[PDB]
Structure 1
Amino acid sequence: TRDQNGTWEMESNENFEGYMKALDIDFATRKIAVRLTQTKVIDQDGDNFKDKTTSTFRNYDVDFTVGVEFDEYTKSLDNRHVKALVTWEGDVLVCVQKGEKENRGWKKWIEGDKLYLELTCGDQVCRQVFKKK
């Protein structure tokens, strides 16, 4: 078939590094690129093609109900089991992940059109700010 329409998810990628080196793509970029999954969206109508390639490293999906403890396997992060509980403290959503790691959890809250997330583990704190699309 000549019909290449569809949404296509990468299954394998052989010698992407060699090809990128031939193009002179910088080292930093290649090191990232080889690790990414790619998704390809092809819109084909007769002889007209629109091709969109997107690259992704890892996803993280978590579902929870506030006030309901749950077993959480942090797959594709550090791969541990923790007992997670998310509760409200004012308008701050607060998560504690009980497990091997001390002081593990997070805080997530809104101010104006921005979302603030503070991730904690051990004595380390990571602070992230998101803007609404």
Structure 2
Amino acid sequence: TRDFNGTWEMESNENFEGYMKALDIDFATRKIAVRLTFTLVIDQDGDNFKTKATSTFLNYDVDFTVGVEFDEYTKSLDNRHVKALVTWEGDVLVCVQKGEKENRGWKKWIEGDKLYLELTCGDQVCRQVFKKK
């Protein structure tokens, strides 16, 4: 399936700290962020995605169109400029954030009712799993 619509509640989180440290996120923010769960809300209409991940503290809020590159300021996260592009590799949704950091981006896919997220920066991979509400 290429349909990621839903409210996705966090089931699993592995190595979020390594990903954030590879982005050089300030220590106090990273130490608080690694403790906190969050919910991922995806509104998808064709190529058009609105995604938002909300925790009691931090924010993640990105809208994009599959196949359309966009210049992105990463704002609240690590305050960097990247050229972001989201495409399909089969049923895996792949994002590359071209810029200073190597191997920066993510992959999302659905495997037996659960949403998998792999966040990558440099040699660090964070894996998260969510269940659909």
Q: TM-score, normalised by structure 2?
A: 0.60
Structure 1 segment 1-133 matched on structure 2, within 5 A:
56-133=56-133
Seen in structure 2, the aligned counterparts of structure 1 residues 18 and 5 have a Cα distance that, compared at 3 Å, is: same
CA contact (8 A) 2:48 2:66 kept: no
Deviates most, 89-98 or 55-64? 55-64
- Identity score, percent: 95
Whether the aligned pair in 2 keeps the contact of 1:37 and 1:55 (CA below 8 Å) is: yes
Q: For this pair of structures, how many residues does the alignment match?
A: 133
CA RMSD of superposed structures (Å): 15.5
Question: Which segment drifts farther, 11-20 or 58-67?
Answer: 11-20
Q: Is the 8 A contact 2:48 2:65 kept in 1?
A: no
Identify if the C-alpha distance between structure 1 residues 107 and 13 changes in structure 2 by more than 3 Å, giving closer, same or farther: closer
Q: Deviations over 1:73-123 (max 9, x none)?
A: 111111101000000000000000000000100000001210000010000
C-alpha change, 1:131 and 1:82, in structure 2 (3 Å) is same
Contact 2:119/2:126 (<8 A) preserved: yes
* Residue segments in structure 1 that go unaligned for 5+ positions in a row: none
**Contact map agreement 1:37 1:57 (CA 8 A) in 2:** no
Provide, for residues 30-84 of structure 1, a one-character-per-residue CA deviation record: whole Å limited to 9, x for no partner. Answer: 9969999999999999999999999720111100000000011111111101000
Change (3 A) 1:111 1:80: same
Choose between structure 1 and 2 for higher RCO, CA contacts under 8 A separated by at least 6 residues: 2
**Segment drifting more, 76-85 vs 3-12:** 3-12
Report SS of the residue matched to 1:110: strand
Per-residue displacement from partner, 1:1-24 (whole Å, max 9, x unpaired)? Answer: 999999999999999999999999
The range that moved more, 7-16 or 33-42, is 7-16
Say whether the 8 Å CA contact 1:35–1:57 is kept in structure 2: no
Question: Cα distance 1:68–1:31, how it changes in 2: closer, same or farther (>3 A)?
Answer: closer
